[PDB]
Design a protein that fits this description.
part of a larger assembly, 9 chains, A alpha+beta, B little secondary structure, C alpha+beta, F mainly beta, B: two-stranded antiparallel sheet, 0% helix, F: mainly beta, two-stranded antiparallel ribbon, 2 strands, binds calcium ion, virus like particle/protein binding, Virus, VIRUS LIKE PARTICLE-PROTEIN BINDING complex, assembly protein E3, Spike glycoprotein E2
Chain lengths: 50, 53, 49, 159, 49, 38, 53, 38, 106
């Protein structure tokens, strides 16, 4: 199990609170912080789609 | 016409998929117009039928 | 691969001697063709020499 | 299943970069070339360009198209309108995001060009494109038949 | 290998410094007396510096 | 069966097309084998 | 990948000797070695018709 | 600022056009710099 | 660089055709030595191009569905500058004194 970050929020990486089709810049800034991460592919695939 | 020839032959049978189609329960074969065909199956036993249009 | 791998007695003799090292190979899976391997033409190699 | 693979280049855009050999001189090109990776065997290269492939001019899927920045306004053309050549003409297979999969013969440069209604765009970079045989016979074009052998080529899919 | 290259950091009428990143074989060097050109026009308004 | 090149899809007739050409809304195989179950 | 296949060499035998007539289509490596403690290998690129004793 | 090749006119964005393209009535450089004084 | 009637049109070429004079736009004229070339400009009888090396030059266009060509066996050579021998000029380096054909017409 790995928890990602957007703020002081350890949300499940497979279910992010935002998606790119509804938030253009906030999801990119969400992926900005979780670059050094073993769980970046899951957050990626769950971050574009819903 | 100078003394050098190449050799003609009967063409073979070219299997064509765009002929066989599915109905509800059977296999529908629609040969092209003015042209014969033949169908070979092994769904039941050994089978051969030269259908014409 | 040398001169005279093809030997026809006259120009229109209708009987030729061929020793060209022709070998048949196995075709590729899902392809209708005749593959073969043979030594290249010795009349061309004689023209090159 | 191809769209979950594809969707990450929706996040991006094409851009205009600098090509030293444009159609006339040095200019700022919509199709500038970053690298040409030819380390596989049978003549498949992998370009990385300043353009995108597979997206429409808005951001969604579209089959065989190039997407490029043109002074700010992102435009698009079909992919059969884009030609490229090293020495002989090449053959584009597919594109996906910033990358393209061609099939080029060997040569000491690579030139990509498309044509608008009367404006011709080009980019030539001095990058060695090379051809690699497999095994102990040094062909220049791959044969019509022979024994099957193991190789290492660029994969066609965008997985 | 693959020579990765970070994008250039341009400052108009100012100066820069070098921040290390401890990347493999990382070369860093600053260049002055520049007058760059984007596709739109001159990126700076200063002649030198 | 299997294409020799890894990233390819195989048509009905044995012709290998790229895997991103399957289920795309454009016919590429003879008799549309990439356009059957999409 | 499909790789080509060179023509069959024409092997002539002698007392403790093997001759090889080699007609290549495109350049081809001939790699020989002895099966003893000293292999004495020979990596050669032959592009033309050549006899190797 | 001059160009390198001895017969070129220089646009506003640094790009060098041939010298007879300066006042030719057809837009060559970005923002029509060459066509401004003819 | 001239119009078929005799005016000065921008980028066109003006050719005779069995006594009568025609014209096409210059971007339908193509030439190549070994690989394709790129026409820069032209003035009077003289075209300026940019070409790789080869044994010949084939200038060609296509007015109707009738293709015009001419190949002449004239060597085109690519001449590098400096002590380092290249075939296509590099993306970067240092600037030396070279001598190229001047793009203008003075
Ligand atoms: Ca398709
Ligand atoms: Ca102009």
């Amino acid at each position: 199990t790995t928890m990602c970050l957007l703020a002081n929020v350890t949300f499940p990486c497979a279910q992010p609170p935002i998606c790119y089709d509804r938030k253009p810049a906030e999801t990119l800034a969400m992926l900005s912080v979780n670059v050094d991460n073993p769980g970046y592919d899951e957050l990626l695939e769950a971050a574009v789609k819903c | 016409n100078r003394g050098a020839y190449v050799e003609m032959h009967l063409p073979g049978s070219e299997v064509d998929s765009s002929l066989v189609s599915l109905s509800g329960s059977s296999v529908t074969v629609t040969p092209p117009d003015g042209t014969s065909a033949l169908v070979e199956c092994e769904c039941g036993g050994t089978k051969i039928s030269e259908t014409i249009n | 691969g040398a001169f005279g791998d093809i030997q026809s007695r006259t120009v229109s003799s209708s009987d030729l001697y061929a020793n060209t090292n022709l070998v048949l190979q196995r075709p590729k899976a899902g392809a209708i063709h005749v593959p073969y391997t043979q030594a290249p033409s010795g009349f061309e190699q004689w023209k090159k020499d | 299943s191809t769209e979950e693979l594809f969707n990450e280049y929706k996040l991006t855009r094409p851009y205009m970069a600098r090509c030293i050999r444009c159609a006339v001189g040095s200019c700022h090109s919509p199709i500038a070339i970053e690298a040409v990776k030819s380390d596989g065997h049978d003549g498949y290269v992998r370009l990385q360009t300043s353009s995108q492939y597979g997206l429409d001019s808005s951001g969604n899927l579209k089959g065989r198209t190039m997407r490029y920045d043109m002074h700010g306004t992102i435009k698009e053309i079909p992919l059969h309108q884009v030609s490229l050549y090293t020495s002989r003409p090449c053959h584009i297979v597919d594109g996906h995001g910033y990358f393209l999969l061609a099939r080029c013969p060997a040569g000491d440069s690579i030139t990509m060009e498309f044509k608008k209604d009367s404006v011709r765009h080009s980019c030539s970079v001095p990058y060695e494109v090379k051809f690699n045989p497999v095994g102990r016979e040094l062909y220049t074009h791959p044969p019509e038949h022979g024994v099957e052998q193991a190789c290492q080529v660029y994969a066609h899919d965008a997985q | 290998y693959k020579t990765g290259m970070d994008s250039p950091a341009i400052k108009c009428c100012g100066s820069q410094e070098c921040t290390p990143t401890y990347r493999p074989d990382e070369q860093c060097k600053v260049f002055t007396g520049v007058y760059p050109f984007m596709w739109g026009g001159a990126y700076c308004f200063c002649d030198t510096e | 069966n299997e294409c020799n090149i890894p990233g390819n899809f195989m048509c009905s007739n044995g012709r290998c097309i790229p895997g991103a050409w399957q289920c795309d809304g454009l016919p590429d195989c003879f008799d549309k084998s990439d356009e059957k179950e999409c | 990948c499909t790789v080509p296949l060179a023509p069959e060499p024409m092997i002539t035998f002698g007392f403790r000797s093997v001759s090889l007539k080699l007609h290549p289509k495109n350049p081809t490596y001939l790699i020989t070695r002895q099966l003893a403690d000293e292999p004495h290998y020979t990596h050669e690129l032959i592009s033309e018709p050549a006899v190797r004793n």
